[PDB]
């Protein structure tokens, strides 16, 4: 697990460590794996990025 730099979670306002769940539809919306696992924002397709690079 790595920190995705300058990314904040729009579910819990924490950092995004490990997989980043970035919404494909909204311009600027992201979930940490805990907020993704709780079923936040499930109306929109996302990209799941296991690491920043």
């Amino acid at each position: 697990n790595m920190v995705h730099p300058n990314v904040i979670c729009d579910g819990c306002n924490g950092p995004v460590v490990g997989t980043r769940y970035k919404c494909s539809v909204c311009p600027d919306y992201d979930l940490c794996s805990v907020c993704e696992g709780k079923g936040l924002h499930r109306g929109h397709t996302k990209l799941a990025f296991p690491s920043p690079f």
Partner: peptide, 4 residues
Amino acid sequence: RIVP
């Protein structure tokens, strides 16, 4: 979100 991005905090740039």
